[PDB]
Amino acid sequence: FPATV
Amino acid sequence: FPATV
Amino acid sequence: GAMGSMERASLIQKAKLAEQAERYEDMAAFMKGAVEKGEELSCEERNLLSVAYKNVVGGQRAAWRVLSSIEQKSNEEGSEEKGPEVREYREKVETELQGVCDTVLGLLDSHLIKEAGDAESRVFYLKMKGDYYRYLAEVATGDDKKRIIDSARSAYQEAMDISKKEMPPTNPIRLGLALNFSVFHYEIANSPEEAISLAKTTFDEAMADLHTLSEDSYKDSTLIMQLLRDNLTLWT
Amino acid sequence: GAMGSMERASLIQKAKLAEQAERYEDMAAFMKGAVEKGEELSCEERNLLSVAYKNVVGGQRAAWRVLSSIEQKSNEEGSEEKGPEVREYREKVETELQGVCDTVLGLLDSHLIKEAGDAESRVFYLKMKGDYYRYLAEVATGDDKKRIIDSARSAYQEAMDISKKEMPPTNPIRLGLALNFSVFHYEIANSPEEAISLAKTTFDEAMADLHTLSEDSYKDSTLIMQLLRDNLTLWT
Ligand SMILES: *CC(=O)Nc1ccc(-c2nc3ccccn3c2Nc2c(C)cc(O)cc2C)cc1
Ligand SMILES: *CC(=O)Nc1ccc(-c2nc3ccccn3c2Nc2c(C)cc(O)cc2C)cc1
Ligand SMILES: [Ca+2]
Ligand SMILES: [Ca+2]
Ligand SMILES: [Ca+2]
Ligand SMILES: [Ca+2]
Ligand SMILES: [Ca+2]
Ligand SMILES: [Ca+2]
Ligand SMILES: [Ca+2]
Ligand SMILES: [Ca+2]
Ligand SMILES: [Cl-]
Ligand SMILES: [Cl-]
Ligand SMILES: [Mg+2]
Ligand SMILES: [Mg+2]
Ligand SMILES: [Mg+2]
Ligand SMILES: [Mg+2]
DSSP, rough: OOOOO | OOOOO | OOTSSOHHHHHHHHHHHHHHOOHHHHHHHHHHHTTOOOOOHHHHHHHHHHHHHHHHHHHHHHHHHHHHHHHHHHHSSTTTOSSSSHHHHHHHHHHHHHHHHHHHHHHHHIHHHHHSSHHHHHHHHHHHHHHHHHHHHHHOOOHHHHHHHHHHHHHHOOOOOOOOHHHOTOHHHHHHHHHHHHHHHIIIIIIIHHHHHHHHHHHHHHHHEEEGHHHHHHHHHHHHHHHHHHHHHOOO | OOTSSSOOHHHHHHHHHHTTTHHHHHHHHHHHHTTTTTTTTOOOHHHHHHHHHHHHHHHHHHHHHHHHHHHHHSSTTOOOOSSSSHHHHHHHHHHHHHHHHHHHHHHIIIIIIHHHOOOHHHHHHHHHHHHHHHHHHHHHOOOTTHHHHHHHHHHHHHHHHHHHHHHOOOHHHHHHHHHHEEEHIIIISSSSHHHHHHHHHHHHHHTTTTSSSOOHHHHHHHHHHHHHHHHHHHHO
């Protein structure tokens, strides 16, 4: 999965 | 802490 | 509400204790109670709210993905019929997840966003609105899926517009918003080119503004810039 | 009970799904429902029950320790008064932990232990009884602390007596029981010499019986033997 904050 | 199972 | 009898300051104090104890459900309940006192939240308090719910929904999303994968495998050719239990349990977790999202969106709508006038607060809350609609979109399969996606898009876009006008390109809130909206494009809106363009432009415009920053601000901004780079590396 | 309408087999199936999804509270609720159907549990089912509650109470114990440490520091000389919140929240977590222990002990008493006649099942359940009284003892500070400790001791001792008569010294249940009773001696009963003696004798008697085992049984037994060695290394 891609990075989120 | 010591090991328990 | 069960937190109605507890002082605002005590709820904040206990949210911080819950974080230390990795008790994120408790942390979220304390912060919900704090929001429902009706006063605006400080920067620190906004971040307590976000950390709490991010951790709760993060765990639900991870569980939902495990169960969805099992369910998908069950509907492949040659898979033995095991009954309704996988679907039921995936639905149970999904309903819980949707409930948490609805809770967060409810707090934002009643009345955090409408009282947020400073860019830092308003962008933060609109990013949250986009995020929690995005989580609803991840599990949506019905007649309202398009509307859920558009709700996420709209919230992110309003946040983007404010952030570009009112914040420097290195501002961590602005950077994190762009990171997440880029992921929305890639994973939800079937728009990988938009995702890549946004991540690249955001990274490059931040790079050009790093020279203005203190050592500590530089550290904060470059950390998020690396996440943009990580996604670009994954996608290209 | 909320699980009263769900089939036993469906509860077991969903406990396994919950484990895969790391949803241990759900797993425990499913297994409680399965126990309350009133039928005895198979080996696999007993292990599902234990895994679920071990994970739930394990998280509570970790949180309680964090909060207890903060509370202890607050009562040192020179510490600023912060009000009742640390104590309150530690008490909240403690009460939840005690509730889970009471739930497990309730299942054992109604009626898992009394229907368990085979050594493998009876020892397993009596070990569980000792363990959950031990967890109650960890947080006990009142008039009943001695009785709680004695309840743990008594359950462990009955399990030990059966295990020594009915199981080989390499049996994993026997080994795990001895490991945990040794920890009880060290951490709860203020009996480090007894703890060390038990761990050493258990290890040595298992070592002497390894020659009787298959490759797979050898792997299982040596894994637990290493835990005994690890504790001995910590304590000597
Ligand atoms: C006042 C305010 O909101 N300031 C703020 C909040 C959050 C961050 C932040 N710093 C780091 C470092 C590593 C990973 C994540 N984060 C965050 N998280 C967010 C970011 C980057 C952006 C938004 O919009 C929200 C959050 C929670 C820095 C400064
Ligand atoms: C039928 C039965 O109960 N058999 C059984 C249960 C549990 C184990 C076991 N194997 C391993 C390996 C590494 C760490 C822990 N464990 C366990 N756990 C237990 C042990 C060793 C002893 C007792 O009494 C209970 C448990 C849950 C092996 C065989
Ligand atoms: Ca088949
Ligand atoms: Ca089935
Ligand atoms: Ca659904
Ligand atoms: Ca305002
Ligand atoms: Ca002072
Ligand atoms: Ca206080
Ligand atoms: Ca208490
Ligand atoms: Ca029986
Ligand atoms: Cl279910
Ligand atoms: Cl509390
Ligand atoms: Mg007040
Ligand atoms: Mg644009
Ligand atoms: Mg039936
Ligand atoms: Mg003895």
